[PDB]
């Protein structure tokens, strides 16, 4: 799991063989219905290949209910956790690389060119460019809604603190392979 999620976070783990592992006997392996019902209870499942080697069928976190008490599928996939961690790291390192130590000034103020000043309208464009890089990489889906939902402002209570609200849209993985054959008789 670590190797796969380090190579590419937004990639499912539908068929990954476990090398050098001995599966249980054919009388102990969970049936299809048993595995299906067990996947809802927050426990991941395994499958046995055509050869003797066993593989992981689906990796799922034990998260099954929201804070208020109802069911919530947001944090189900481990891919969401991995992608979120990578996105947080990318944001942190891009901000650190671009604006290490800059003065903070209001949006409308203008100073001498070539000075170290950041305005709330600069980091917004920086984040939009970062999102476009994410979309090129293949981890985020929709750019228009991200642009229309992104919000960056000054704190208005503490002088040097900038509040952001990104709300990105993660990419999706293929679970079902629907096919439809049509005979033109």
């Amino acid at each position: 799991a670590s190797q796969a999620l380090s190579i590419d976070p937004a990639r499912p783990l539908q068929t990954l063989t476990l090398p050098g592992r001995m599966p249980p006997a054919v009388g102990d392996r969970f049936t299809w219905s048993e595995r299906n019902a067990l996947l809802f209870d927050g426990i991941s499942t395994f499958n046995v290949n055509d050869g003797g080697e066993m593989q992981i069928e689906r990796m799922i976190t034990m998260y099954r209910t929201n804070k208020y008490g109802d069911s919530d599928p947001s944090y189900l996939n481990v891919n969401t956790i991995a992608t979120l961690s990578y996105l947080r790291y990318s944001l942190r390192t891009r901000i650190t690389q671009k604006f290490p130590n800059y003065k903070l000034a209001s949006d409308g103020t203008r100073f001498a060119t070539g000075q170290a000043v950041v305005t709330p309208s600069v980091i917004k464009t920086e984040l939009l460019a970062l999102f476009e890089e994410w979309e090129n990489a293949g981890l985020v889906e929709d750019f228009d809604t991200f642009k229309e939902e992104l919000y960056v402002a000054r704190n208005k209570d503490d002088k040097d603190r900038l509040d952001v609200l990104c709300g990105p849209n993660l990419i999706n993985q293929f679970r079902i392979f629907a096919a439809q054959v049509q005979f033109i008789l």
């Binding site: 671009k98 203008r110 060119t113 070539g114 464009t125 920086e126 460019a129 476009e132």
Partner: protein
């Protein structure tokens, strides 16, 4: 009766350039060309890249030594009445010359988005 257009502001990496009047901006998309036989059949696409051209006064805080080595910048062509176009990963273009007192800058990019 809002202001239509005027002096346009160029910003790379978050720094203004104070370019002189005459800034131009070509967005990136598909170019349509006609195809003609016995009649006109339709259009034939051709890709193009986004580009921003301007001229800056010489002797300013940003000099040619800094200008030449530009291969990864985030350009923002912004008008007076909003209408900002962002070039994600742009690079300098064919030739800078310090003719008279104006340096001609042209920055090209693979994609142009509206902010």
């Amino acid at each position: 009766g809002n202001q239509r257009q005027g002096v346009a502001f160029i910003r790379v990496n978050g720094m203004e350039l104070e370019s002189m009047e005459g800034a131009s901006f070509t967005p990136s998309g598909i170019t349509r060309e006609e195809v003609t036989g016995s009649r006109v059949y339709g259009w034939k696409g051709k890709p193009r890249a986004a580009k921003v051209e301007c001229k800056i006064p010489g002797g300013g805080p940003i000099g040619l030594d800094e200008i030449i080595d530009w291969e990864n910048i985030t350009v923002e062509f912004q008008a007076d009445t909003g209408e900002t176009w962002m070039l994600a990963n742009a690079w300098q273009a064919d030739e800078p010359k310090n003719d008279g007192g104006e340096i001609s800058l042209v920055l090209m990019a693979k994609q142009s988005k509206r902010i």
